Amino acid sequence: GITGTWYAQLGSTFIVTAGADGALTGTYESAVGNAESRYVLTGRYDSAPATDGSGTALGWTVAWKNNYRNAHSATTWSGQYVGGAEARINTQWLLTSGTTEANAWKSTLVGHDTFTKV
Amino acid sequence: GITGTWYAQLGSTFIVTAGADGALTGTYESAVGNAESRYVLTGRYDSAPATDGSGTALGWTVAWKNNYRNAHSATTWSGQYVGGAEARINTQWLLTSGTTEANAWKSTLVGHDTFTK
Amino acid sequence: GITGTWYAQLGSTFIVTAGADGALTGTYESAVGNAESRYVLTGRYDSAPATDGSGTALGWTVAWKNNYRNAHSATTWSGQYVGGAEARINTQWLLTSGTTEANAWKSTLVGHDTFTKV
Amino acid sequence: GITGTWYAQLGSTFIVTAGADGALTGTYESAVGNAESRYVLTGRYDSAPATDGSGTALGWTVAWKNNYRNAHSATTWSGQYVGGAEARINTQWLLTSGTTEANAWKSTLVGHDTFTKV
Ligand SMILES: O=C(O)CCCC[C@@H]1SC[C@@H]2NC(=O)N[C@@H]21
Ligand SMILES: O=C(O)CCCC[C@@H]1SC[C@@H]2NC(=O)N[C@@H]21
Ligand SMILES: O=C(O)CCCC[C@@H]1SC[C@@H]2NC(=O)N[C@@H]21
Ligand SMILES: O=C(O)CCCC[C@@H]1SC[C@@H]2NC(=O)N[C@@H]21
Numbered sequence: 001g002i003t004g005t006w007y008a009q010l011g012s013t014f015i016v017t018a019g020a021d022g023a024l025t026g027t028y029e030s031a032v033g034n035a036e037s038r039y040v041l042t043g044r045y046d047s048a049p050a051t052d053g054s055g056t057a058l059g060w061t062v063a064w065k066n067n068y069r070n071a072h073s074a075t076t077w078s079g080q081y082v083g084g085a086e087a088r089i090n091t092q093w094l095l096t097s098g099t100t101e102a103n104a105w106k107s108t109l110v111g112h113d114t115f116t117k118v
Numbered sequence: 119g120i121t122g123t124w125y126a127q128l129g130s131t132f133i134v135t136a137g138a139d140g141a142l143t144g145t146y147e148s149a150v151g152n153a154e155s156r157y158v159l160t161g162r163y164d165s166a167p168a169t170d171g172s173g174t175a176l177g178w179t180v181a182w183k184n185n186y187r188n189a190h191s192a193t194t195w196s197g198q199y200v201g202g203a204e205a206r207i208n209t210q211w212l213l214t215s216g217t218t219e220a221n222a223w224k225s226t227l228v229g230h231d232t233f234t235k
Numbered sequence: 236g237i238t239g240t241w242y243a244q245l246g247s248t249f250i251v252t253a254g255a256d257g258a259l260t261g262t263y264e265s266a267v268g269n270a271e272s273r274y275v276l277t278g279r280y281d282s283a284p285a286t287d288g289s290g291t292a293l294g295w296t297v298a299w300k301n302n303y304r305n306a307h308s309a310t311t312w313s314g315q316y317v318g319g320a321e322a323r324i325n326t327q328w329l330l331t332s333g334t335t336e337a338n339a340w341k342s343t344l345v346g347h348d349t350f351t352k353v
Numbered sequence: 354g355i356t357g358t359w360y361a362q363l364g365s366t367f368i369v370t371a372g373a374d375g376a377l378t379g380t381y382e383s384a385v386g387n388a389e390s391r392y393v394l395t396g397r398y399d400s401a402p403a404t405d406g407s408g409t410a411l412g413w414t415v416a417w418k419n420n421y422r423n424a425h426s427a428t429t430w431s432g433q434y435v436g437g438a439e440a441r442i443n444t445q446w447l448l449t450s451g452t453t454e455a456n457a458w459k460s461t462l463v464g465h466d467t468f469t470k471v
Binding site: 257258259275276277278279280281282283284285287288289290291292293294295296297298299300305307308309310311312313314315317325326327328329330331332333334335336339342343345 | 374375394395397398402403408409416426428429449450451452
């Protein structure tokens with residue numbers, strides 16, 4: 001049920017495909033930040049989830065470079081898929097920008113995105 | 119200078135190839151936790167980093183499921199590559215385990231790994 | 236604006252007094268984890284926020300030790316107060332448990348809590 | 354012990370006092386960022402740690418307003434005190450800046466500071 005087009009609360013668009021090999025592949029389009037149009041994404045999910053009610057662990061990465069623009073940053077979303085009526089992906093994320101060593105302390109933003117298909 | 123074998127301070131070994139597209143492909147062997155043997159990794163990196171002296175931003179993910187076991191969890195490392203004599207990959211990570219939604223508040227461990235050649 | 240009772244989506248209850256000086260004092264009661272009854276909180280807030288409509292920065296810490304129970308752990312919430320329609324305090328938090336050195340890699344949980352007056 | 358003068362890897366000076374009541378009080382002086390001189394800090398720590406070799410959980414907060422300037426931001430450090438050998442304090446921290454609603458996704462930085470007495 002992961003495979004599909006999802007939207008973040010931010011309004012960003014997350015198009016993903018979950019392979020039977022546990023792969024995640026698609027594109028990301030951010031509603032905010034130093035970004036434009038779509039960015040490639042790759043990640044991994046648990047292809048054989050617990051059957052107890054547990055969500056499905058997954059993660060994916062976006063390097064914020066594409067054909068038009070390079071923010072010299074990468075975001076990784078770590079989280080889980082939750083099934084049901086209104087399936088959601090609840091994540092937390094780390095957005096690291098390349099920095100000088102002096103500035104590494106402020107290299108990384110953290111936050112949380114929730115994704116629905118609506 | 120990212121492609122090859124990297125070693126975290128925990129003892130873990132990260133084996134990776136960086137493709138010109140911006141792909142990261144490889145395998146991770148954890149020294150800790152619910153883990154055994156090698157695990158597939160996939161991620162992205164900035165193929166065209168800045169020149170002012172900035173590291174190369176990258177991130178990758180491991181779903182802790184392989185031939186030998188399934189821990190029902192995944193880790194994303196987000197951070198940057200810093201070249202030079204003692205190159206490093208300096209990361210922060212998020213490890214999300216699948217939980218009931220009642221337990222989702224404690225789903226996610228945060229930490230940091232420094233990798234070296 | 237900050238002084239008073241606030242409620243976590245989780246169910247937890249947070250009572251604070253914001254000192255003119257920038258002090259945060261009060262109690263926290265968790266709806267989850269190794270916790271029982273109320274715990275002391277202390278923290279700091281920006282007592283001179285900007286006037287552009289920007290939220291008010293603040294933070295607080297709870298060590299999960301009280302007269303009843305001790306989890307050997309601590310949580311810090313970092314975030315901002317937003318006033319208006321429905322005032323809110325939006326946060327992210329870090330919960331660190333005491334661990335041996337060999338288990339330090341798994342010492343800390345990360346999440347987010349949004350608080351409201353109702 | 355936790356009381357004393359601590360130095361982060363960053364060069365920052367952490368001057369803290371751990372009370373009997375489990376309070377953390379003192380001043381923080383960052384070597385980096387939109388800050389100068391000393392800022393009040395306040396926090397909590399576990400006054401009754403385990404005795405299995407487990408570290409000591411604690412955390413504190415700094416609002417980055419003082420008499421010289423106001424960054425409209427606050428950091429919280431969450432971590433644990435590790436005694437014996439080169440005693441040290443290992444933390445992760447969250448730095449939230451007051452922002453509009455639109456800009457809240459980039460309001461929070463995250464990192465890790467290790468403190469030693471050297
Ligand atoms: O500004 C950059 O460095 C690149 C744009 C990053 C946008 C971030 S990634 C986390 C969050 N979720 C989104 O959909 N957008 C923001
Ligand atoms: O326990 C699990 O759920 C799977 C193995 C977890 C290993 C973690 S990922 C973060 C940290 N860095 C490592 O090299 N290993 C641990
Ligand atoms: O289990 C412990 O060690 C104590 C944890 C207390 C509850 C946590 S703190 C972060 C989150 N927000 C809450 O209101 N409760 C949980
Ligand atoms: O820039 C600001 O908003 C205030 C300065 C913040 C300095 C940060 S707090 C985390 C890190 N550790 C330090 O000692 N300094 C930086």
